[PDB]
Design an enzyme around this catalytic site. Sequence first.
Site, PDB file in Angstrom:
ATOM      1  N   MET A  90       0.791  -1.250   0.000  1.00 34.90           N
ATOM      2  CA  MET A  90       0.000   0.000   0.000  1.00 34.90           C
ATOM      3  C   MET A  90       0.823   1.302   0.000  1.00 34.90           C
ATOM      4  O   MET A  90       0.269   2.392  -0.113  1.00 34.90           O
ATOM      5  CB  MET A  90      -1.013   0.016   1.159  1.00 34.90           C
ATOM      6  CG  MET A  90      -2.084  -1.087   1.047  1.00 34.90           C
ATOM      7  SD  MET A  90      -3.395  -0.881   2.313  1.00 34.90           S
ATOM      8  CE  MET A  90      -2.479  -1.092   3.850  1.00 34.90           C
ATOM      9  N   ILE A 105      -2.553   7.807   3.368  1.00 37.08           N
ATOM     10  CA  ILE A 105      -1.493   8.364   4.213  1.00 37.08           C
ATOM     11  C   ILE A 105      -0.623   9.404   3.477  1.00 37.08           C
ATOM     12  O   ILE A 105       0.086  10.191   4.110  1.00 37.08           O
ATOM     13  CB  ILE A 105      -0.579   7.262   4.804  1.00 37.08           C
ATOM     14  CG1 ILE A 105      -0.173   7.625   6.252  1.00 37.08           C
ATOM     15  CG2 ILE A 105       0.637   7.026   3.899  1.00 37.08           C
ATOM     16  CD1 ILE A 105       0.521   6.495   7.005  1.00 37.08           C
ATOM     17  N   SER A 128      -3.559   8.351  -0.932  1.00 32.81           N
ATOM     18  CA  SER A 128      -4.055   7.072  -1.477  1.00 32.81           C
ATOM     19  C   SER A 128      -5.563   6.943  -1.743  1.00 32.81           C
ATOM     20  O   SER A 128      -6.002   5.990  -2.375  1.00 32.81           O
ATOM     21  CB  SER A 128      -3.549   5.903  -0.636  1.00 32.81           C
ATOM     22  OG  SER A 128      -2.183   5.671  -0.901  1.00 32.81           O
TER      23      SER A 128
END
Lengths: 543, 545
Positions: free
Chosen positions: A160, A207, A210
Amino acid sequence: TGRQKARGAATRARQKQRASLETMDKAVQRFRLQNPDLDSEALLTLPLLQLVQKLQSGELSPEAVFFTYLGKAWEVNKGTNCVTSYLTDCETQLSQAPRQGLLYGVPVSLKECFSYKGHDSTLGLSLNEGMPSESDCVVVQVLKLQGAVPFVHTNVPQSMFSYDCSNPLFGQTMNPWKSSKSPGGSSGGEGALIGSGGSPLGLGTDIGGSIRFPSAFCGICGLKPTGNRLSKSGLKGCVYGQTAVQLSLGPMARDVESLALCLKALLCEHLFTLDPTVPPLPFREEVYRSSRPLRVGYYETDNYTMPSPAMRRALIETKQRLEAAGHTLIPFLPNNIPYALEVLSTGGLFSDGGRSFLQNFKGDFVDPCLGDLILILRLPSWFKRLLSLLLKPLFPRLAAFLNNMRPRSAEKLWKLQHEIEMYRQSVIAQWKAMNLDVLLTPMLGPALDLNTPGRATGAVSYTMLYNCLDFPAGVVPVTTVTAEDDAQMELYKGYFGDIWDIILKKAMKNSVGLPVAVQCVALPWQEELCLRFMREVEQLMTP
Amino acid sequence: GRQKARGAATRARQKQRASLETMDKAVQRFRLQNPDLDSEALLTLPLLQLVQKLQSGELSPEAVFFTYLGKAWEVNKGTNCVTSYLTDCETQLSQAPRQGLLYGVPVSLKECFSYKGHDSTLGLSLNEGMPSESDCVVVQVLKLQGAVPFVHTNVPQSMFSYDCSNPLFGQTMNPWKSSKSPGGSSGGEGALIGSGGSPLGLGTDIGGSIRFPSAFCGICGLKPTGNRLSKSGLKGCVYGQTAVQLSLGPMARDVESLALCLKALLCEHLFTLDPTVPPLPFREEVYRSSRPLRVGYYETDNYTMPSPAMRRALIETKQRLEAAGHTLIPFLPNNIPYALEVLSTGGLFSDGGRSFLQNFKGDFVDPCLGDLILILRLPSWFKRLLSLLLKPLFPRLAAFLNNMRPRSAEKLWKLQHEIEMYRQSVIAQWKAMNLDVLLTPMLGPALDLNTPGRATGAVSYTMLYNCLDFPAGVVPVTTVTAEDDAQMELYKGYFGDIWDIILKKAMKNSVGLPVAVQCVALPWQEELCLRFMREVEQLMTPQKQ
Ligand SMILES: *[C@](=O)([C][C][C][C][C][C]C1=[C][C]=[C][C]=[C]1)C1=N[C]=C(C2=[C][C]=[C]C(C([O])=O)=N2)O1
Ligand SMILES: *[C@](=O)([C][C][C][C][C][C]C1=[C][C]=[C][C]=[C]1)C1=N[C]=C(C2=[C][C]=[C]C(C([O])=O)=N2)O1
Ligand SMILES: [Cl-]
Ligand code: NA
């Protein structure tokens, strides 16, 4: 060799994905046979609020809505590879959905990190394969208690920590507008699925952008709330205990009203009791529905990432339509952006030099979409430092990021956390001195070529700023790239002329017709006002 | 090598002396003009009724202000709780917004609440002669609500202590007994309010600092969830430490006062002045609820043996709650020793104390801090050696010492995550028993002067809730009897280490001193915490309502 375990994980992950899609197809065909009459295209084009109204009134059955969307999702997955797993028992959840729920009968798609009982949340990492969640995360529970039907997990870039969307287990997700383009990330599966009509509502996390990158790249709306507005309890992650730059979760959807409804449904007693750590702030309808003139700060560029010509036009046209609509537009740029990005954000994300993050990749393949991030993080601190000194005279930006990705003492982390706190108060003071209500900014676009976000780290500047500040920030589609926008991009130089500026020009080549967004920001805890502002932009730019 | 610190102390004492003389002058001038004023009547009105009479015009703000100023000056003589008179407050008096929810209410402030023009020394030479240049946010809000902040009250040096002495202003004494600590670090507030010299004050709390002085001095205090109220502009001594959050909150003579203070603070003024605070309005209906509660309880944390008075306080309160129809359910947060020794200690001292220690460079170290500064200064390798030696006989000391070592950012992340998981684990226990609130012992009676710094273990009752970041308040419910006090001779502690030995002696000779219980609710549930405190107050001390 050193990859036997990772190879076995990928083999099983792909067979699970394939079996998931086969199951969806079977269910869809069975349903279509019994229901040859149903007007599926009418149902799929209904805006979510209307879909919801007809589900509440009985005009549409939850089964019709469920299988129609299931079929669309399966179809759009063909060209996008956005779906990793069909959340199997969702058929039974369908039949038992709470009837007065605010999301009754609504199929919802979930970024793979939203833990769902009985399913892996791999994040594309071999070490998370074959580790099914013991239970639904909190936000999944609340969705279900509000009558929604979570139906798929969607793809994310490996770990991610990326704004592209490929991993070695499920492969690469492609933009539904142009298959050579990234859908953005890390919530890229969501962006691709919602952006192509395969889901009316999804959840992502953010963060460094995203939620906003994939929303903008795929032409849909997205909101990243203040970090602690919604519960992260039960979410699958890859770094733990890093609290300088907080993760945030939020909705993605085809319009702003859908984001508002999703937030309204999540912010209920159910959520606040399942996760007492989240402040029990209900959705303030009166703020969201307000139609007063706004004081709107705005900037055309952050002086860090030169905007593409389409980004700059999108921003200026939105500013001009807002002014024509009676709002006051005030030039405004948060102070010390390079510090916020290079020292505070990068430093907070990598306080330990990346060692914790790196534990995830031991024995694993490193997806090409991650670029050299893993190889750079693995460098010894002394060598990161030396390399930074050498780069500094020629490429200060690269030098700065590198020096700030080194490990440090707890003592230095406290100092950094204090600086983050003071910087937040500095920008808030700056904001209040101009008496702003909200802030309008460029948003990165159009979509970059596959496997290029990993090589254009500088371009997170427009988004990561508001993670560092922890302000709610959302994006709204306002235009598409024109021939002229696209031609002008061929002259793009950037402000630094380093590898990141050079990559961006090439990565944005061939973009005519792609969606471009702007970003809307408000102060901490002011999600309602931020959405009120997004709604205004949506009304003016897509009439 | 100490001329600097000596000069600082000389200037500070002169400034305090001059502040008190200014008060004396103002008080006498007022009294000569108001010879018929019934000051005793005014001083004994509960804050709620005081507020009502100010709002109606029945009492003038001047009468209330100067009457409290006089009382504050008088009780200061025996307690040494006031460090500074907030001089411009008489003009604030004449400009207080008339519809403010605290219109005309004199409010006392712990010295760390920055007030324009005044030092916030924290008892440290390095902060002496460096006046704040702005009111902190909570001070601005009090003023916008029509309150009149009027004094800064004393703290132990650095605030990292539950006693109350520093080398600048000296030692604050318990108003009930001059050989006793008033507690701390909000000890001046405890002594001033506890002796009747202020109807309302603000304190801070990282390991108990609102709750100890409230309990030792026999008043009510609430430590909210850390981010319920704005810390913007406060004076501190350690910055960027976020594992164990600091919290600010009200202290007062009764629970209704705490509720009124919270209601006045939780307004648009505060939420716009500090947008980082979630804009949660005070939920009046939750505070006012009369529904039966499911009340978890414990009579001991098995870490600090309760004094016989603490135990009796807890059991009597439990029985009155049962008689009132509440459901009392035994409950103990899991892994307390781990939460105190690893999480709380490691969180407070992640850097080995280096940042904290910078505050003491070239300063005297007040005796009330005990050996803390000496111990923190020791080399990490030596802390480790000493820990190993101590472990077999004195596990608890060994553990604190081991967990006060410096560490990497990587280890701090790991610790922060363990804190997050621990919070969720206690929340899960609470939910499994369907608790509304939690009743626990509160440290008391007051310890002898200069002993809290040598009984670190006794922070167990309070610090657990800074670790968990749950709102927690204390309510006085009884006083030490001769019977309770004689029983201290049978007290051993669970460990028998130096902290138990010091505690045993420190709690003796306490006949007549106040003893409290502690009331706890889940994060963000201050109104429910206050609803429970109000119930305890009513059942144990009905005359307060
Ligand atoms: C996205 O917001 C990530 C978007 C790309 C940010 C890259 C920033 C960067 C800064 C400096 C150097 C290189 C790159 C997103 N969604 C989830 C996450 C994420 C990231 C780390 C850890 C976790 C977690 O534990 O859940 N999530 O990032
Ligand atoms: C009080 O809560 C302090 C109460 C005593 C806690 C002692 C705990 C302990 C000591 C030794 C070893 C382990 C645990 C209080 N009020 C304010 C503060 C405080 C402390 C540090 C920093 C700050 C700040 O910067 O504002 N405040 O403690
Ligand atoms: Cl918060
Ligand atoms: Na000691």
